[PDB]
Amino acid sequence: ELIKEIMHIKLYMEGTVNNHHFKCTSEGEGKPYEGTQTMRVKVVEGGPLPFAFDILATSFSRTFINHTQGIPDFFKQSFPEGFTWERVTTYEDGGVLTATQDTSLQDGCLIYNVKIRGVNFPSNGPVMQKKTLGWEASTEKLKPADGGLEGRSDMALKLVGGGHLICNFKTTYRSKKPAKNLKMPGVYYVDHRLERIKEADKETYVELHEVSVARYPDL
């Protein structure tokens, strides 16, 4: 089957956000066919992060997406090799977070390897002052873009005692399997819900849950 009904995950992440180098590590598990998953994150380097963790949570699983209707799963079809993704998130206040990700399948446990580069996050802004809450539920429009998938989405980051700091991202998904060995999907949508379950000792340990359900557009 390759991708089982319940799958284990292990993650490695490192980066610099406003030149503040850090390193993160994770262990998680989800139901790939149901679109749910859970991730327990631990910041191993760069002490208590000077920026809001929320900018990183969104880089911590395309393989855990409930493909309803009968949409070809580009992500699951890409195994055992896996797939890569490059995302660029642009914030309304000038902050830009670029992330590079590698997904592989080694000895049953699913492996994620992320690279993070955050720049121009304003000093007294919600991210740097750590005055952000969760991410509101978002929707990503995916369209087949020459061999891979291109995903665009507009997100809203909840703010401490306020409204939101909005942003948008452009992502490119590249399969490790050749495009010849893949049945590509049409233009489809993925609705996401990203909730933070737990938090410990100054955003050093964070538990996150995600729910993703794919669907063909309405008529």
Residue numbers in the entry: 7 to 66, 70 to 228
Quote the study's own text.
True genetically encoded monomeric fluorescent timers (tFTs) change their fluorescent color as a result of the complete transition of the blue form into the red form over time. Here, we engineered novel blue-to-red tFTs, called TagFT and mTagFT, which were derived from the TagRFP protein. The blue forms of the TagFT and mTagFT timers had absorption/excitation/emission maxima at 405/408/457 and 404/406/461 nm, respectively. The red forms of the TagFT and mTagFT timers had absorption/excitation/emission maxima at 557/556/582 and 562/557/590 nm, respectively.
To understand the effect of mutations introduced during mTagFT’s development on its blue-to-red timer properties, we determined the crystal structure of the mTagFT red form with 2.9 Å resolution. mTagFT has a typical β-barrel overall structure with the chromophore formed by 65LYG67 amino acids located in the central α-helix. There was a lack of electron density around the tyrosine moiety of the chromophores, probably reflecting their flexibility and/or poor crystal quality. Unlike the Fast-FT blue-to-red fluorescent timer, mTagFT has an intact chromophore without clear signs of covalent bond cleavage and contains serine residues in the 148 and 168 positions (enumeration follows to Figure 1) near the phenolic hydroxyl of the chromophore. Hence, biochemical data support the formation of the trans-chromophore in the mTagFT protein. Taking into account an absence of the IF2 interface in mTagFT, this indicates the effective destruction of this interface due to the M151K, Y153K, and C229P mutations. Notably, the crystal structure of mTagFT does not have a canonical IF1 interface; instead, there is another weak interface (approximately 7 HB/SB), with one disulfide bond made by C118, of two adjacent subunits, where the N11I mutation is located. Therefore, mTagFT contained three mutations, M65L, Q220L, and A224S, that might be associated with its blue-to-red timer properties.
